[PDB]
Amino acid sequence: MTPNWSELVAAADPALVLPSGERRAEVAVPGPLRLDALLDLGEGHAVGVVRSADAARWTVPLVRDGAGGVRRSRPGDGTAEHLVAALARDAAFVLEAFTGAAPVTGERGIIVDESVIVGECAVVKWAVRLPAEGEPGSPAAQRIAALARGGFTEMPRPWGLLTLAEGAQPVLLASVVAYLPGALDGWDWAVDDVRRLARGELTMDQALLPAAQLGTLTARMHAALAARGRTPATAADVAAWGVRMREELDEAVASVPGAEGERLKAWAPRIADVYAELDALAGTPLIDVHGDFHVGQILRADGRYAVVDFDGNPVLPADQRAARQPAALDVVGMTASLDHVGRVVVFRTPDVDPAPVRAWIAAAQRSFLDAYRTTLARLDADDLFDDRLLTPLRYAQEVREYLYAVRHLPHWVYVPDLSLTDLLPERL
Ligand SMILES: [Cl-]
Ligand SMILES: [Cl-]
Ligand SMILES: [Mg+2]
Ligand SMILES: [Mg+2]
Ligand SMILES: [Mg+2]
Ligand SMILES: [Mg+2]
Ligand SMILES: [Mg+2]
């Protein structure tokens, strides 16, 4: 008889677990492989949770093939199709389907960051590397499900989620969401809006509306996420925040060159002064947040806004990205991002008049916060936002931009330099 899935995986080349296939033999995945869990999708298709001999765990879309026995599914094999069908139609797994899932067919691969377009209307995203058993990984499945359950719709419509039932949070193995082919992210559309403002093709009112819509979206998002509950920050939590933020400040002060570096070195005492007041913020509410929130995570098409990318903050250790944080963290991420959009327009656009752009920077931050506060109040969710955190967390956001610059793009130091120039009290 044909072996079971376990015997096929144990006998398969260890490169089975790799999306891009076998690599150089000198650094091959160590075998033998072991199948820890298997969701049978029918007709020779499956989702495996596979362990390599180094204890690393993997999500593997599998297909039985008479050529080699088993191999990793490729776009066009139909495994993503079969996952979608299992949504429309083993205790280790949780398959959650949402309204709108349909058994669409036809697969096309696309390169992101593995993602497979199905029926030219849905996107299946396979997790690849998983955390160790019982350890936290990406919270994207918990975020998307909480949003859908809360009636939040300003995101690609969820079709389904496949998770492994273990640990504090179910481990994400695959997500299926609506495909938005004609959608750009904010680093395209927000820059274009403000550029058009600078050219006089939009009025200030027109160029400010997206900032208000973003504020409403963020408030709707937080209200839905907060329905899963909240956790008061402890004294140790806020103390840890200050240590981390001061260390990042010290690194930026030690690495930023030139005039920007001199001004930052002169500003560091005041920034540190503000970080010091975090000790009085013990008890501030922590909720499930987006955690990596900025205009690049917002798709816009035909006046519809959609937030994506719920894996968490990529600079935190992988096992901390699911942790709850202050809602104000997302708030400052977006308001900082809006400021930066304005800085980029001025820096990149020939013959631009910075006066209207800088007026827009200030007015856009006010438009966002007003809409955010008004929407939270309309949703009776006012108390998740502790605005005492605005200044310390915003400063820390700008310091992160210095570190990005010195590590990846040196000239980018102008963004936090000009942002902080306008943020800091002009009394110093
Ligand atoms: Cl500027
Ligand atoms: Cl730039
Ligand atoms: Mg072989
Ligand atoms: Mg090999
Ligand atoms: Mg080796
Ligand atoms: Mg993103
Ligand atoms: Mg991400």
Residue numbers in the entry: 1 to 89, 95 to 118, 122 to 436
Q: What did the paper state?
A:
Here, we identify and characterize a unique GlcN kinase from the soil bacterium Streptacidiphilus jiangxiensis, closely related to Streptomyces spp., the classical antibiotic producers. In contrast, from 20 sugars and 4 aminoglycoside antibiotics tested, SjGlcNK only phosphorylated specifically GlcN and displayed vestigial activity with glucose using ATP as a phosphate donor. Determination of the Michaelis constants (Km) for glucose and GlcN suggested that SjGlcNK is better described as a GlcN kinase (EC 2.7.1.8) with a strong preference for using GlcN (Km = 8 ± 1 mM) over glucose (Km > 100 mM) as the substrate. In addition, the structural and biochemical characterization of SjGlcNK provides new insights into the role of these unique GlcN kinases as the missing link for the incorporation of environmental GlcN to the metabolism of GlcNAc in bacteria, an important intermediate in peptidoglycan biosynthesis, glycolysis, and secondary metabolite production.
The crystal structure of SjGlcNK was solved at 1.98-Å resolution and reveals a typical eukaryotic protein kinase fold, consisting of an N-lobe (formed by an N-terminal cap and an intermediate subdomain) and a C-lobe separated by a linker, with a relative arrangement that results in an overall bean shape. The important conserved catalytic motifs, the DFD loop and the catalytic loop, are located in an acidic groove between the two lobes, whereas the P-loop is in the vicinity of this patch. Structural differences between SjGlcNK and mycobacterial maltokinases are mainly found in the N-terminal cap subdomain. The SjGlcNK N-terminal cap is composed of three long antiparallel β-strands (βA-βB-βC) forming a curved β-sheet enclosing α-helices α1 and α2 and by an additional β-strand (βD) perpendicular to strand βB on its concave surface. The intermediate subdomain of SjGlcNK, which is composed of a six-stranded β-sheet (βF-βG-βH-βJ-βI-βE) flanked by two α-helical segments (α3 and α4), is almost identical to that of mycobacterial maltokinases, with a root mean square deviation (RMSD) of 1.7 Å for 80 aligned Cα atoms. A seven-residue linker (residues 187 to 193) connects the intermediate subdomain to the C-terminal lobe (residues 194 to 438), which is composed of two central 4-helical bundles (α5-α6-α10-α11 and α7-α8-α12-α13) and a small two-stranded β-sheet (βK-βL), with an additional helix α9, also present in MtMak, preceding βK and downstream of the catalytic loop. SjGlcNK was crystallized in two different monoclinic (P21) crystal forms, A and B, which differ considerably in the dimensions of the respective unit cells. In consequence, there are two SjGlcNK molecules in the asymmetric unit (AU) of crystal form A, while four monomers are found in the larger AU of crystal form B. In contrast to the structural conservation of the individual subdomains, the relative positions of the N- and C-lobes are strikingly different in the six molecules.
